[PDB]
């Protein structure tokens, strides 16, 4: 079934394979980002605070992709609605557009207990 709706704006996320829901979710992801954007955490997280409080901040090495997490989903959502679209310079002085999906589960680099 070929369908899907407030997906991203380039199939760039599609190939890759990450799944986004359309409710809101406490954890987000940076697309067109990543440190394979050159884009360094004090660079992305900057950004992640001054909308809402950053509890953690998922990196990834080698991908233009990454995933974060705010304290309290009204916070989320608003970085979705803000961050989203929005441009940033990256390390090489050029402004990148990145898009904040709303995502459910997030393979983070800790064991979930429960």
């Not at 369908?3 to 809101?24: C, N, P």
């Not at 954007?37 to 409080?53: A, I, M, Y």
């Not at 705010?70 to 557009?97: C, H, M, P």
Request: proline share 4%.
């Amino acid at each position: 079934g070929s369908s899907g709706s407030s997906g991203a704006k380039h199939t760039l996320l599609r190939h890759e394979g990450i799944e986004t829901v359309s409710y809101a979710t406490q954890s987000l992801v940076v697309a067109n980002g990543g440190l394979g954007n050159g884009v360094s955490r004090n660079q992305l997280l900057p950004v992640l605070e001054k909308c809402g409080l950053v509890d953690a901040l998922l990196m990834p090495p080698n991908k233009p992709y990454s995933f974060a997490r705010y304290r309290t989903t009204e916070e989320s959502k608003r970085a979705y609605v803000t961050l989203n679209g929005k441009e940033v310079v990256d390390d090489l002085g050029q402004k990148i557009t990145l898009y904040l999906n709303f995502v459910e589960k997030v393979q983070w680099s800790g064991p979930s207990s429960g």
